[PDB]
Amino acid sequence: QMGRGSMHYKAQLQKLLTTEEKKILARLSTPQKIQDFLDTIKNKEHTMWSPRAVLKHKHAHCMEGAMLAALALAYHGHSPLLMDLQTTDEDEDHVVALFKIDGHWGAISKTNHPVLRYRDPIYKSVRELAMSYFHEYFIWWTKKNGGKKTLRAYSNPFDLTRYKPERWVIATGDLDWLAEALDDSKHFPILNKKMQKQLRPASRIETKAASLSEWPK
Amino acid sequence: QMGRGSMHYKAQLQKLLTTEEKKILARLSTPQKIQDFLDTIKNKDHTMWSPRAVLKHKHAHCMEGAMLAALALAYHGHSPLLMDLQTTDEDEDHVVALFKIDGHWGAISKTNHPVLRYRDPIYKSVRELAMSYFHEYFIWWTKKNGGKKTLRAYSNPFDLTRYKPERWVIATGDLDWLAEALDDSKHFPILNKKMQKQLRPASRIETKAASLSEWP
Known part of the structure; x- marks a missing residue:
């Protein structure tokens, strides 16, 4: 299946995880299966829960969801x-x-x-x-700059392998240092100042569509 | 500063268009102004109207909208x-x-x-x-393959300059031959058979959101 580094990394994850947590991650054996699993988790004070906390409480914002996804991907040999x-x-x-x-x-x-x-x-x-x-x-969510396109940059892929898995996989703290390290990593701008002046606001039908909510219900 | 080919093409368009049509196209001097104009045209639910017919009846499906846009772009010197x-x-x-x-x-x-x-x-x-x-x-719009992702290919840019502008700008016929010529042009596939097997259906929230209607 996977390479030496990946098998080693999986072994380190198995040392930290309970049999219940591993039984869950073993089932999530494709990216599609992982997204299906996050679809069953309720979407979201301020928090930054570990994958352990997210599997316990079945509640997640975007980075909590992505860290659990990254864990599940790593358990089957992906970075x-x-x-x-x-x-x-x-x-x-x-x-x-x-x-x-x-x-x-x-x-x-x-x-x-x-x-x-x-x-x-x-x-x-x-x-x-x-x-x-x-x-x-x-x-x-407001008429004030209604439809303004706000994306400005994307990060390089941020490999969580650089940290000891203890620090994030099963952390009981808030991982604000991890969020901050992600925000400080290499980003690539999508626009220059000329391109920004060209931008057209999204239409009313688009802002109405974006406002629809999965959770509750 | 507009090129020789573009100025010539614009001259051919001016011979075909009424003063009312040209007054409209002169206003639509940026891509954004063109999209703003198409926002005021009623979307349709077969036809294949010319830009003339679309400006007259203020109704368009996607290719009728795009042909009018392409005309307005050419009137200001774009291909x-x-x-x-x-x-x-x-x-x-x-x-x-x-x-x-x-x-x-x-x-x-x-x-x-x-x-x-x-x-x-x-x-x-x-x-x-x-x-x-x-x-x-x-x-x-149906539960039958609900949420299936259906895009398979995109065309090269299709330059309408290859045709005599009379043939499409002011045509009274249906331009099914123009649709057919576009569908027959070089397309680039997005997937192979392996990638197609990877595809995941769109969610229920996405199909509900897509179902919202500008018109009526």
Whole structure:
């Protein structure tokens, strides 16, 4: 199956996890199965729960969802990769878990709205995948700059392998240092100042569509 | 500063158009102003009207919208470019009008739903722009293959300059031959058979959101 580094990394994860947690991760053996699992978790004070906490309470915001996805991907031999989607100060950033199948990038995403969703493994580069989010990242919750497109940059794939898995997989603290390290990593701008002046606000039908909610119900 | 070919093409268009038609096209001097204008046209639920018919009756499906956009782009010196988005037989193709500003591709689009919309001129290649549509091209109107992602290929930019402008700008016929020529042009596949087997259906929240209607 997987390489030496991956099998070693999986072994370190198995030392930290309970039999129940491993039985769950063993079932999530494709990126599609992982997204299906996050679909059963209730979408979200302030928190930054570990994958352990998320599996216990079955509640997650986008980075909590992406860290659990990255864990499940690593348990089946993928790199635990996050990508930050970074907006203007008018909006909140969004995090996904990147994956590759046959040389093509996909993304697992935990969101409550019909935008910034899952991406199939069909995108030839990180850039191409990231640009598939741009048009649907906009102000939908106020008339003030209604429809303004707010995405400005995407991170390099952020490999959680650089940290001891104890520090995030089963942490009882808040992992704000991990969020901060992601936000501080290499990002690539999507626009220059000229391109920003060209931007057209999303239509009323688009802001109405974006406002629909998965949770509750 | 507009080129010789473009000025000549614009001259041919001016011979064919009424003063009212030219007054409209003169106003639509940016891609954004064109999309704003298509927003005031009623979306349709077979026809294949000319830009003349669309300006007269203020009604358009996607290719009628894109042909009017391409005309308005050409009236200000852009190439009148169409891109075909080609689906499985479970769905209908969608056509946009391509444009470039400072080396980056955008797209003008006439649709009734909050998917397959306008694209800002920020995309580094036709491929990159086309791939920005893939995830939001799915079956939302039936439970039969509910949520199936149906996009399979995108055309090369289709330059309408190859035809005598009389043939489409002011045609009174149906332009089924023009639709057929677009569908027959070079297309680039997005998937192979392996990748198609990977595809995941769109969620219920996505199919509900896609179902929303601008018109009536």
